[PDB]
Design an enzyme around this catalytic site. Structure first.
Site, PDB file in Angstrom:
ATOM      1  N   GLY A 146       0.812  -1.224   0.000  1.00  0.00           N
ATOM      2  CA  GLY A 146       0.000   0.000   0.000  1.00  0.00           C
ATOM      3  C   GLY A 146       0.844   1.273   0.000  1.00  0.00           C
ATOM      4  O   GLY A 146       0.249   2.321  -0.280  1.00  0.00           O
ATOM      5  N   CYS A 148       3.699   1.752  -1.887  1.00  0.00           N
ATOM      6  CA  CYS A 148       4.407   1.952  -3.180  1.00  0.00           C
ATOM      7  C   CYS A 148       3.859   3.187  -3.889  1.00  0.00           C
ATOM      8  O   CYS A 148       2.621   3.419  -3.992  1.00  0.00           O
ATOM      9  CB  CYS A 148       4.434   0.704  -4.061  1.00  0.00           C
ATOM     10  SG  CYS A 148       5.478  -0.565  -3.280  1.00  0.00           S
TER      11      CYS A 148
END
Ligand SMILES: O=S(=O)(NC1CCCC1)C1CCOCC1
Length: 182
Positions: A146, A148
């Site tokens: 989540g 990135c």
């Protein structure tokens, strides 16, 4: 809470969109005009969702260095009706180490998220998911799925985008001014 978080908030409020591909939702940094960046593992296609609006991709280029090694940065030009604030003057010219960085994320899963990650090392080479990758920054924070595309900043500089982690360390791809000359 302090001047680091202040710079990070200023970048998130004006220079980020939520990008959705077939491989997930990502924080996406807008750099100038209709040009943004995203991790290459997002697998950008001909169409992307930007804040839940169907958007044509005018151009997408997965960057590699002059050793033909992955950098994990894709530069996207969006068919959007609005330009980004130009933040190129906040991009470092050179590979470097940093003190006191913040990782900032904005998605449906993690809205208005800011993490003080501390010291950032010029790590260099990383086998990222099996792919030899260069120009990696490392910070000692247990980053999760989540995050990135999350933006890495110091007070004054936008230095990278989050691209992975090993459970104890997190890793970002460098942003350099030379990627966005026109
Ligand atoms: O010299 S920088 O690293 N990069 C600039 C890019 C365009 C001209 C120079 C600058 C980054 C923000 O903090 C002050 C220094």
């Amino acid at each position: 809470m302090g001047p680091g978080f202040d710079f990070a908030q200023a970048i998130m409020k004006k220079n980020t969109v939520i990008a959705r591909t077939e491989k997930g939702e990502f924080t996406m940094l807008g750099v100038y005009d209709r040009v943004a960046v995203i991790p290459t593992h997002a697998s950008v296609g001909e169409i992307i969702y930007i804040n839940d609006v169907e958007t044509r991709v005018l151009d997408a280029c997965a960057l590699r260095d002059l050793t033909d090694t992955n950098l994990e940065i894709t530069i996207v030009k969006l068919d959007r009706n609005q330009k980004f604030r130009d933040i190129r003057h906040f991009l470092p010219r050179c590979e470097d180490d940093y003190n006191d960085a913040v990782l900032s994320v904005h998605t449906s899963k993690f809205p208005n998220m800011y993490i003080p990650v501390g010291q950032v090392t010029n790590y260099g080479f990383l086998n990222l998911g099996g792919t030899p990758t260069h120009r990696i920054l490392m910070y000692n924070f247990p980053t999760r799925a989540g995050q990135c595309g999350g933006v890495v900043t110091t007070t004054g500089k936008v230095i990278g985008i989050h691209v992975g982690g090993n459970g104890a360390q997190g890793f970002a791809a460098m942003l350099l001014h030379s990627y966005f000359t026109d």
